[PDB]
Design a binder for this molecule. Structure first.
Ligand SMILES: OC[C@H]1O[C@H](O)[C@H](F)[C@@H](O)[C@H]1O
Ligand SMILES: [Cl-]
Length: 418
């Protein structure tokens, strides 16, 4: 057997070097520059973004690097280091939703979304992508690709949105629209806000109420694992799963109906009225009594309890109460498994192994149905716990997992410019 693999992040130098070489190898021309956006881990606040809730992501050090050059036509050529001999080619001129074949829908759809928003200066482009955000890990390779492209296009076309947090929300919205409308992949905005608005050493307390302005809807929370002698273990289960299989879309449909039945614009309205009540049990009971469907009650209970767990976590971590922080991780996972029903055995067994082996807490992160777990562990324990999960996976007959180093890293940025 092989020891469990840790997937290291590309350095600035490696990402620039590799994205530039793929660009020159593919297109001959030099790119105008290289941009990059990170993947993410959601610490807590899962399945709350599209309910106008609270989230708490960090940006991983793992980034997607885009070498890009604008074109004076409307042609979009893209290549990825996974498949360097397969250049995808579309044209923005009269391009419609779902008009683009395969992975290239994600970057092409960003240019489309900017044009649809009236950025008429945005024409075609050539790009090359090199990533270390692991595929199928639930760590937002999708956002790393769309957000790196949105930042690169903003820069080369001088749109003026990339150089401010509030400006980056315009580029976030284009990235989200690409994924939802061009690629046909249902997504809230958790991942794209993380990738473009996180900061090094901080978690992004993101308030997803849609009426908030950018300076109202984030709060950088201290997330210095070294201050508490901690390590955030991240394990990609590599469990076989399927994007756009309809499960994630169903959860969203279920929440929207719940909100319709409750007569509220979103479940955050419901959650906040419960949270403010003196008797939160009774406020929840009265809400779930208004939902006749037994699955819908479960989904609403998850959303309401998870939003409050975010607040609880921000307080626990600021207090250095790592046991309390870990219990909140654990209650988030347990809710996602029992009430939201978005876990699978690989996630649940990895989490149990982490819990049994000294984690303060452990949970799936991201959408679920596969992908990754995270665990708050003591510094120096991540490798041991990752290998315990790997040994257990082999006993279970599961695909080997892989792990990634993790800490709160910087958001998207320009990496190089001619
Ligand atoms: O918190 C669950 C997440 O699932 C997926 O990653 C989505 F992309 C995010 O928007 C979010 O809903
Ligand atoms: Cl559902």
């Amino acid at each position: 057997m092989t020891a469990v693999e840790f997937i290291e992040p590309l350095t600035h130098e490696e990402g620039v070097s590799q994205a530039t070489k793929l660009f020159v190898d593919t297109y001959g021309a030099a790119p105008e520059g290289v941009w990059a956006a990170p993947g993410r881990v959601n610490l807590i606040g899962e399945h709350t973004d599209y309910n106008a809730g609270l989230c708490l992501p960090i940006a991983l050090p793992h980034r997607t690097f885009i070498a890009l050059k604008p074109r004076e036509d409307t042609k979009v050529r893209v290549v990825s280091g996974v498949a360097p001999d397969k250049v995808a080619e579309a044209d923005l001129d009269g391009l419609k939703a779902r008009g683009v074949d395969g992975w290239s829908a994600y970057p092409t759809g960003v240019a489309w979304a900017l044009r649809q928003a009236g950025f008429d200066k945005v024409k075609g482009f050539d790009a090359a992508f090199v990533s270390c955000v692991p595929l199928g890990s639930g760590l937002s390779s999708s956002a790393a690709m769309t957000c790196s492209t949105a930042l690169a296009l903003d820069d080369v076309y001088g749109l003026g949105y990339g150089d401010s947090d509030a400006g980056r929300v315009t580029l976030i919205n284009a990235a989200i629209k690409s994924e939802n409308e061009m690629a046909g992949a249902s997504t809230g905005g958790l991942d794209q806000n993380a990738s473009m608005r996180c900061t090094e050493g901080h978690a992004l307390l993101l308030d997803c109420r849609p009426e908030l302005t950018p300076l109202e809807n984030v709060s950088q929370q201290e997330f210095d694992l070294d201050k508490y002698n901690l390590e955030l273990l991240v394990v990609d289960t590599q469990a076989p799963h399927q994007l756009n299989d309809g499960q994630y879309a169903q959860r969203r449909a279920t929440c929207e109906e719940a909100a319709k039945i409750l007569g509220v614009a979103n479940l955050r309205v419901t959650a906040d009225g419960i949270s403010k009540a003196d008797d939160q049990f009774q406020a929840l009971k009265e809400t779930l009594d208004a939902l006749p469907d037994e699955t819908m009650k479960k989904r609403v209970r998850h959303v309401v309890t998870e939003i409050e767990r975010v607040r609880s976590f921000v307080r626990a971590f600021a207090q250095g109460d790592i046991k309390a922080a870990g219990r909140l991780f654990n209650a988030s996972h347990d809710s996602l498994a029992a009430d939201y029903e978005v876990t699978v055995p690989e996630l649940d067994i990895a989490v149990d192994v982490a819990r049994k082996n000294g984690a303060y807490g452990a949970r799936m992160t991201g959408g679920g149905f596969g992908g990754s777990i995270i665990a708050l562990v003591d510094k120096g324990q991540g490798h041991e716990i990752a290998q315990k999960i790997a040994d257990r996976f082999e006993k279970e007959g599961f695909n080997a997992p892989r792990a990634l180093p993790a800490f709160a890293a910087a958001s998207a940025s320009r990496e190089a410019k001619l």
